[PDB]
């Protein structure tokens, strides 16, 4: 599949969920990017205006792509693989309740998974992998990619 063909990648937060403090959204997303820059040559920078490679959006129901959200539960988020335009973008279902902790749906953990897709990863069959497509809270303060995730991303970058 597609990959980014450059090392400096930008992201922009289109809008903020009212579920969380603004600074906590910023930090969760920053930390999620750091998970992947830790194990690749990629460098991520937040921009506040203009066209970013990865646009982060909170939206509910039908929201202008061909892929609608479904209210609370079920689909939590989705993201597009590397490419122009909508490529790379990561969308989070506002009908979920996003948090910094084990309550609701943890934004950081979900963003790690989605950014994996934004960088070109698909799903893993390994339940230990962050790319395993079932959300499960794990302690975010000690979170680590599985060997499978590191294998996956290092097949695309580095
Ligand atoms: O795969 C999907 C669509 N399905 S999902 O949104 O139910 C979903 C979303 C995120 C996750 C997830 C997996 C591991 C950690 C955090 C979230 C699981 C299911 N989007 O990427
Ligand atoms: Ca949903
Ligand atoms: Ca994009
Ligand atoms: Ca919400
Ligand atoms: Zn979408
Ligand atoms: Zn997924």
From Swiss-Prot:
Key word Ribosomal protein present: no
Record-level GO BP terms: bronchiole development; cellular response to virus; collagen catabolic process; elastin catabolic process; extracellular matrix disassembly; extracellular matrix organization; lung alveolus development; negative regulation of endothelial cell-matrix adhesion via fibronectin
Encoding gene (name): MMP12
Residues given in the record as Ca(2+) 3 binding sites: 70-71, 73, 75, 93, 96
Keywords for the protein's UniProt record, in alphabetical order: Calcium, Disulfide bond, Extracellular matrix, Glycoprotein, Hydrolase, Metal-binding, Metalloprotease, Protease, Repeat, Secreted, Signal, Zinc, Zymogen
Record's protein name: Macrophage metalloelastase
UniProt-annotated location(s): Secreted, Extracellular space, Extracellular matrix
Residues where Zn(2+) 1 binds: 63, 65, 78, 91
Positions of the catalytic residues: 114
Function field: May be involved in tissue injury and remodeling. Has significant elastolytic activity. Can accept large and small amino acids at the P1' site, but has a preference for leucine. Aromatic or hydrophobic residues are preferred at the P1 site, with small hydrophobic residues (preferably alanine) occupying P3.
Residues involved in Zn(2+) 2 binding: 113, 117, 123
GO CC entries: cytoplasm; extracellular matrix; extracellular region; extracellular space; nucleus
Tissue distribution: Found in alveolar macrophages but not in peripheral blood monocytes.
């Amino acid at each position: 599949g597609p990959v980014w063909r450059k090392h400096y990648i930008t992201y922009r937060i289109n809008n903020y969920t009212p579920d969380m403090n603004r600074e906590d959204v910023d930090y969760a997303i920053r930390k999620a990017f750091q998970v992947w820059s830790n194990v690749t040559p990629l460098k991520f920078s937040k921009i506040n205006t203009g066209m970013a490679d990865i646009l982060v959006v909170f939206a509910r129901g039908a929201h202008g792509d061909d892929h609608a959200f479904d209210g609370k539960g079920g689909i939590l988020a989705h993201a597009f693989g590397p490419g122009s335009g909508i490529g790379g973008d990561a969308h989070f279902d506002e009908d979920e309740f996003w948090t910094t902790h084990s309550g609701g749906t943890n934004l950081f953990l979900t963003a790690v998974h989605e950014i994996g897709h934004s960088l070109g990863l698909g799903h893993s069959s390994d339940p230990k992998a962050v790319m395993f497509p079932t959300y499960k809270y794990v302690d975010i303060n000690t979170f680590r990619l599985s060997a499978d995730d590191i294998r996956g991303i290092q097949s695309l970058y580095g």
